[PDB]
């Protein structure tokens, strides 16, 4: 086996101007425990301070992007005041400051429950394997500890299509997500990482100070 069924963690690979971050807990369909939330935030931080990295690519090892939060492991470890990211981290859901200031591309496949959706909406370019399944299952349960829905879904899909899914928790697939403007592209299973890298390389080809200026500008449009 290579699928990790232990505590979550994230792989890190510098490929030229690209910084690849892989969710590494495939034996648990990448359900996020405190270890993997800490490690993902730290890797995002490292990306931010890496002068050579011009674009990050976030992806998942295995057949599933994420099956949501590991609430059984998380619960005991939240303080009354909430979940806190490690010093040096950047919030992978883009709620808490500091905000990332460099581009991000994301590849998703298979299962993308819950906190997965917002994680993916926090990117600049999103590609999915055909047949990927998305759902806000948590609205059926109660308010989650983190990764809850924001304005990013309504902004992209328009109000009513977003509410159709946010308030019911019903499943939608990658074609529906593309139709709603949450994804740039749907490709064949096994192609998402590669297609995501093509996008990240084009961004990396552009002029770093321009790209950052462009992002800052846009971030201020929506804030």
């Amino acid at each position: 086996s290579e699928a990790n069924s232990g505590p979550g963690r994230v792989t890190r690979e510098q490929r030229g101007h690209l910084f690849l971050i892989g969710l590494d807990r495939a034996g648990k369909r990448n359900a996020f425990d405190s270890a993997m939330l800490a490690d993902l935030a730290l890797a995002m931080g490292e990306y931010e301070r890496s002068e050579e990295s011009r674009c990050a690519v976030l992806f998942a090892h295995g057949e599933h992007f994420t099956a949501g939060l590991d609430l059984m492991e998380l619960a005991p470890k939240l303080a009354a005041s909430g979940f806190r990211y490690p010093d040096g981290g950047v919030d992978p859901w883009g709620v808490v400051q500091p905000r990332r200031s460099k581009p991000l591309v994301v590849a998703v496949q298979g299962t993308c429950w819950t906190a997965g959706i917002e994680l993916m909406l926090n990117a600049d370019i999103a590609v999915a394997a055909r047949g990927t399944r998305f759902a806000h299952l948590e609205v059926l349960r109660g308010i989650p500890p983190l990764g809850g829905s924001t304005v990013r879904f309504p902004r992209a899909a328009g109000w009513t299509d977003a509410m159709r899914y946010i308030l019911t928790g019903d499943e939608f697939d990658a074609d529906e997500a593309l139709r709603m403007r949450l994804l740039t592209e749907v490709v064949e299973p096994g192609e998402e990482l590669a297609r995501a890298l093509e996008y990240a390389e084009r961004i990396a080809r552009a002029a770093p100070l321009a790209v950052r200026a462009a992002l800052q500008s846009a971030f201020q449009g929506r804030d």
Copy 2:
């Protein structure tokens, strides 16, 4: 059956669903001051109804709404106040709703009905329902006037193409522009709206409420607020 007198609204609790019906078919559900107040009171009561988890707004008759009754209404405004403990159906005046609203529309949907429809979370229309922003052809609209919701849903340009012209569009064009959730066979819009509302009512109410509250952030923020934040950045 059909009421041609002062406007009013039906109310019904059906399990966790709160049903509100426009009841002035006799005038195509044109809104007088009476029906505006009664609709806002019906929403206020939904808000305070512990066990209502979703509201369904629909219209008795063949027509959702012909818009405002300017004859009755104009000679009564400087400006429109809602009753205490009413909630503005148009969602423009505080307080804003905080629970879900699903709306079913059929036939005719003039001016104030469009905006009423875009203030909801799920909108279902009968095939062949007709919409138009007829206000432009005359003068400024006293209420249900044009909003940012239309451009947010449709995009600036497609919204301008109907707002600035007053041109008529149907249910299929409204769907294409993302104003509706779904288009259905005439006579099926309320049954369908109900199924959606039953689905939202099975969700956890605290989680639904907190979802709405996150989404409601800057929802109606105009594009000149974004653009000012940006010009400084450069």
Copy 3:
């Protein structure tokens, strides 16, 4: 006939339509400080023309615009619009208060997507070529599109283009809701007048009202 010198715009009053033409076809309508000022001027003129109920922005020659003329404009940012000018990319104050239709053809780089997203209607000849070259050129965003592009296209498709500088055609622009209509080459100006015409029939005080309401929001 094609202007290769300092930029300028034509103005023609045609009924209740105020027609503004970019006139520097010799340089594919790249915006030097002269065109910017003149366009800004023209736009202020339309604002004060009680006769005009809709403006139509088109370009002379084959190409809408090849973008900013950064070599000439470099020193000009030591940008101040003329008095009584209105910012064509509607970023600075004062903002326009009347409707604007735009017709686009061929090459529409950079500042030209800018102009287009700042209108109420946009018609393009099919085969029009669009691109946000700022990132490739090494220059920052004009401002407006940074906001208006994600609004029309949604975040991911807008970043896909803005962050890469990749080119896209009129059909892709239409799918992303940057355009109202795509028409056959040669039709864009005619089709655009049809829309502006339709806008000129509505009540000008109500037309003004709707606009102000949509800009501000709530």
